[PDB]
Amino acid sequence: SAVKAARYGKDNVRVYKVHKDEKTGVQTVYEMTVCVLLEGEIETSYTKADNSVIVATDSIKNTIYITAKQNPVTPPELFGSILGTHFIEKYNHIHAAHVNIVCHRWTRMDIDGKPHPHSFIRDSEEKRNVQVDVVEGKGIDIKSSLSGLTVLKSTNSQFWGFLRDEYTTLKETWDRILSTDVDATWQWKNFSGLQEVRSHVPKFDATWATAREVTLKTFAEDNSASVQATMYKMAEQILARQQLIETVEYSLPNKHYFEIDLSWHKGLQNTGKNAEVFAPQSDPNGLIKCTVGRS
Amino acid sequence: SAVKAARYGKDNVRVYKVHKDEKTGVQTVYEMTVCVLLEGEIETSYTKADNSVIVATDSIKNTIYITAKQNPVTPPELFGSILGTHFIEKYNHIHAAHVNIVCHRWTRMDIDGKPHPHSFIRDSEEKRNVQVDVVEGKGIDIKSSLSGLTVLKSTNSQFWGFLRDEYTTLKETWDRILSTDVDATWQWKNFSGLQEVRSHVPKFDATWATAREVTLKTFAEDNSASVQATMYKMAEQILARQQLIETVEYSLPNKHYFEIDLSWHKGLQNTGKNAEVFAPQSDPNGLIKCTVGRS
Amino acid sequence: SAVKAARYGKDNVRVYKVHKDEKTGVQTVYEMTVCVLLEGEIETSYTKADNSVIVATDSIKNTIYITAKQNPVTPPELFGSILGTHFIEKYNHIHAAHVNIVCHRWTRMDIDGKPHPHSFIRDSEEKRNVQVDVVEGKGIDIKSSLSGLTVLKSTNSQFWGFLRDEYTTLKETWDRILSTDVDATWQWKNFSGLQEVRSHVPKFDATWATAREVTLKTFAEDNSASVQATMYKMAEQILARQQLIETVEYSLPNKHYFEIDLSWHKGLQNTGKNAEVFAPQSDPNGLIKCTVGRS
Amino acid sequence: SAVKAARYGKDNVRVYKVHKDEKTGVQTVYEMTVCVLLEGEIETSYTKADNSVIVATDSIKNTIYITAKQNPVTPPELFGSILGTHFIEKYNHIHAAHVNIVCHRWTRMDIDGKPHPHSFIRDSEEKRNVQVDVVEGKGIDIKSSLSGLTVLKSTNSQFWGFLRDEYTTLKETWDRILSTDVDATWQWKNFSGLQEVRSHVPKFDATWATAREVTLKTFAEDNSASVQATMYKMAEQILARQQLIETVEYSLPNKHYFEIDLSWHKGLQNTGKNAEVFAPQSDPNGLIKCTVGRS
Numbered sequence A, B, C, D: 001s002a003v004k005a006a007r008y009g010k011d012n013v014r015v016y017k018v019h020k021d022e023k024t025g026v027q028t029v030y031e032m033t034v035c036v037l038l039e040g041e042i043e044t045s046y047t048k049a050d051n052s053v054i055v056a057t058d059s060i061k062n063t064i065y066i067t068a069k070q071n072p073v074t075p076p077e078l079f080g081s082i083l084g085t086h087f088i089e090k091y092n093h094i095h096a097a098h099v100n101i102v103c104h105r106w107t108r109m110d111i112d113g114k115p116h117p118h119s120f121i122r123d124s125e126e127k128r129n130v131q132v133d134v135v136e137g138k139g140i141d142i143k144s145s146l147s148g149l150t151v152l153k154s155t156n157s158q159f160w161g162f163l164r165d166e167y168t169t170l171k172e173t174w175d176r177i178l179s180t181d182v183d184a185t186w187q188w189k190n191f192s193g194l195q196e197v198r199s200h201v202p203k204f205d206a207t208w209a210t211a212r213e214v215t216l217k218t219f220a221e222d223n224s225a226s227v228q229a230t231m232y233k234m235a236e237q238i239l240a241r242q243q244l245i246e247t248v249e250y251s252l253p254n255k256h257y258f259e260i261d262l263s264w265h266k267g268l269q270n271t272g273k274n275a276e277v278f279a280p281q282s283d284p285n286g287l288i289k290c291t292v293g294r295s
């Protein structure tokens, strides 16, 4: 036997940083959950009980907190890149650092019309995420995402003209509910290293905000033929609005809202055009995935 | 042995309802999770396998969807009173209906600063809840709540002057993070019946909104001496502003954000006034409860 | 406005304790999650920002770990009584201690049919719980429970003879799947104090085990007329077998397994006696409660 | 823009099947949760709103239930292979079927020493899983796994001789707790198709049981130098005991149990050799991964 692949590190590292403006007295908060996994010349830690090649997961945890102290935590693309670079540079035998970040929402409260200087609400479980793979002499590969964006539209969704055979029961429809939890990833062009990441810093927040606007606007306005057709329109406009994106990936669940036949009870009419009351289905769900790139 | 208490019914009944304005074409969506438990002459269903006294959990489920077809699902104080009253009136041998409702957020999307007619977003897992006990001959007891309202403030929270003995390690502080998930319940004056609930329907939405505003404002603005002192301020404001409330109850966790000492590392300074990066604590957590009434 | 009720303390305190037999070298592990809330002369901590009456949640946390160092953590009825009694005795102005404990399973591994001295497995998320209310001058109220015991039987469950009206669709059945997650509580006779709890310590483990055996056996063997009729049989057995119990309480969901009609497909037969493949239903679920006492 | 990758299907399909022995009256239950995602000539469903290339997710759901009716659901390697083959054969334009299965535990109850014919307990949340990728003219790729196997050992775990620098605080130790949730995957040699899968059916259950025995026994007996060293020993013996396995992958969290310094309180001694009471850490956690193959 031999080790073909190995990586280890600290998962589920919860971090908070506050910026306090001395000038304005205005405070700003950042909260995230970090995972750092390292690869390199570490096989003997598995094969020969040789811990001398291990940067302890505890020290990795320490390093996440120290990097946050000494560097920006935003945009998360940058923080991830700084943190992964530290590890391949500090340690000769470490050749890759995989950094995953979930950003939690802390939105400034508006109190009596006025933005508050140090109060915040979690206005969604919606996350902003990054996966930063820092690979010595191969560069930095960044995937940026939003996840847990939960949306529903009460009409202007259709599903008909699908294949029918001896396995098919689904009624064609021209008016239905469509609800999803959006997971959307944009894969950046390979970066040569930390310098190139720093060179594109302003694109990260701007690209995330645009991904979010295009998702919300397309969903709200498209008379959806299908989840497939609508998610594709989303990816195309995102690609068009950022040349540094190579691919856009949507993973979208179809969270069914079933019509309820109540006609067995006093001939109550609650289907097709009379559909008022529905049974949200917890499971199963449709799951539709698509990766879109440039021709 | 004898039955001292019994109740049975259907839990976790997912309901959606849409209103479609014919003139405007504006659609409005409502989603909730319902539980109904019945009491009454049912002893023998337990003691003697006499199913003749059971309204089947399935039928209670059917009745929830039918009631929603025939009645407004908002405010949930009303919907819950209607549904409870149905069972004790319909069935001679049923004497009490316990109706629990969790309302899920579907906030109308603004697209290009214009409110969309039929697209919605879940802005937070914040719930509005009701517990409605309809008891034949005693009337209707309604508790209304907001839960899962998650907030943080970065400063203007303190905790000093607490008891100190051989069990105390906690340092006094004049500046700390305060974070919580708000559980806030208002217990209404008993209602004589459905009619009286109906007659007060304009109070339910208004009281829930002022409950929310008072929670958000007081938390934002109070230079908190303690969770205890800040939550008492909220309760007494809500009481002062709605005379049909008998009691207000806060249940608030203290979601700790621990300072990190980094002085062991290159003399890095990250405590007291230098405190920038914190470790949010998943567990344990302070739990602070208070029921406030009229003197 | 005035405070009608208050309690505060630390929730979600994870504790592990190991016993190491010096002679044998057999180790035994205990893991639990603890919550302690105190009442007493604390009103002013809420009304007047008088922290002088607060035993800090942090100190309550420290006291939990210290009590565990100095005392046995089993049975949890005892541990909870010790911990509660500490607070009302230590502090003049504290008059009640509410102690909630969840015990996690660490079952000793058998390796080659030999019980291992220091290796353990979590066999199920089944918990043993206690709720211990220590009230100065009134004594100690203990509720003991098992929860998260998940069971299914494929036959020897029925449900026919239930009420039928314009709200009923459910077909009568003489053969069905019954599945549940058992929540079962036994309420002990009030105790005068810690001494009396101590004097009964051999009853706590034995009653929990016979509670478990009676649940498992009765469920396995009863040709169930209903959840109602089967859960009443369990309660009355446990009562008959422990005279210091005042009441037994089951809370049982009916986790439905729906027949699937496949006759639309190549005349496939999968209902009544042919019923082979079912669709387990996540929601909704029957919820059936019963408190049984002595006549 | 163009579609570079696409797959769609039904996730979270809950299935139950019962075998009833006419001879012995003995019943046996199987429960699982299935996901099927298809690829093929389906790009126009995304680019041209062309649903005519879509086997509806609803029909996929129907097909899962019908396959379960007409075929064995065990071993899950086989069921997955039958179900994925159906889709690439039935539909000319479908070229791959990705099938994921979680198997839930239903263990026969022992009542009074005797195995019960139709009663079952969920004796762990431990799962058995498969990923079956059926790719037209490339064959069948099976990954088998157990997950959610939670274990703890109170001693016979070590961690010393790790790298120390300006980032290191972790104390070396020669006696510590080690707890994990085991996720273990064995990747089978590529199969030419369904026929070859059927040819190896007896290896699937036998290989899973051996993976589980080797995990439990190695964990219990190894005086662990590290998670790395111990998980490697597990993979080697698994590879040695099944030639049809190409690789073994462990993903193991290190679920820290922290010592508690209580010496500040009456000089209480609870560290090193006096360590009795510990604080289980919810987060962060070490995460150690390794893929082992043949030299």
Ligand SMILES: O=c1[nH]c(=O)c2nn[nH]c2[nH]1
Residues within 6 Å of the ligand: A008, A054, A055, A056, A057, A058, A059, D159, D170, D225, D226, D227, D228, D254, D286, D288
């Ligand atoms: O078993 C261990 N492996 C590691 O890599 C590690 N790092 N800190 N503690 C650890 N324990």
Ligand SMILES: O=c1[nH]c(=O)c2nn[nH]c2[nH]1
Residues within 6 Å of the ligand: A170, A257, A258, A259, D058
């Ligand atoms: O009532 C139903 N509505 C649906 O939309 C559906 N889809 N599959 N089965 C279904 N049943």
Ligand SMILES: O=c1[nH]c(=O)c2nn[nH]c2[nH]1
Residues within 6 Å of the ligand: B008, B054, B055, B056, B057, B058, C159, C170, C225, C226, C227, C228, C254, C286, C288
């Ligand atoms: O056991 C049962 N009890 C009930 O009250 C019930 N109602 N529907 N199905 C049921 N099954």
Ligand SMILES: O=c1[nH]c(=O)c2nn[nH]c2[nH]1
Residues within 6 Å of the ligand: B170, B256, B257, B258, B259, B260, C058
């Ligand atoms: O770092 C810490 N911060 C705190 O607020 C605290 N309270 N107890 N222990 C603590 N440690």
Ligand SMILES: O=c1[nH]c(=O)c2nn[nH]c2[nH]1
Residues within 6 Å of the ligand: B159, B170, B225, B226, B227, B228, B254, B286, B288, C008, C054, C055, C056, C057, C058
């Ligand atoms: O606001 C607080 N209230 C308390 O009771 C407490 N105890 N420790 N920290 C605390 N903070």
Ligand SMILES: O=c1[nH]c(=O)c2nn[nH]c2[nH]1
Residues within 6 Å of the ligand: B058, C170, C256, C257, C258, C259, C260
């Ligand atoms: O398929 C079903 N099985 C059931 O047991 C049931 N009860 N109500 N509706 C049902 N549908």
Ligand SMILES: O=c1[nH]c(=O)c2nn[nH]c2[nH]1
Residues within 6 Å of the ligand: A159, A170, A225, A226, A227, A228, A254, A286, A288, D008, D054, D055, D056, D057, D058, D059
């Ligand atoms: O939008 C949809 N896409 C699908 O592929 C599908 N299948 N059933 N319903 C569906 N809805």
Ligand SMILES: O=c1[nH]c(=O)c2nn[nH]c2[nH]1
Residues within 6 Å of the ligand: A058, D170, D257, D258, D259
């Ligand atoms: O008290 C501690 N024990 C540990 O094992 C540890 N590891 N990192 N920090 C730690 N603190």
Ligand SMILES: [Ar]
Residues within 6 Å of the ligand: A015, A016, A017, A030, A031, A032, A068, A073
């Ligand atoms: Ar942060």
Ligand SMILES: [Ar]
Residues within 6 Å of the ligand: A180, A219, A226, A227, A230, A231, A252
């Ligand atoms: Ar969509």
Ligand SMILES: [Ar]
Residues within 6 Å of the ligand: B015, B016, B017, B030, B031, B032, B068, B073
């Ligand atoms: Ar609703």
Ligand SMILES: [Ar]
Residues within 6 Å of the ligand: B180, B219, B226, B227, B230, B231, B252
């Ligand atoms: Ar507060």
Ligand SMILES: [Ar]
Residues within 6 Å of the ligand: C015, C016, C017, C030, C031, C032, C068, C073
């Ligand atoms: Ar414990």
Ligand SMILES: [Ar]
Residues within 6 Å of the ligand: C180, C219, C226, C227, C230, C231, C252
């Ligand atoms: Ar039962």
Ligand SMILES: [Ar]
Residues within 6 Å of the ligand: D015, D016, D017, D030, D031, D032, D068, D073
């Ligand atoms: Ar199954």
Ligand SMILES: [Ar]
Residues within 6 Å of the ligand: D180, D219, D226, D227, D230, D231, D252
């Ligand atoms: Ar291990």
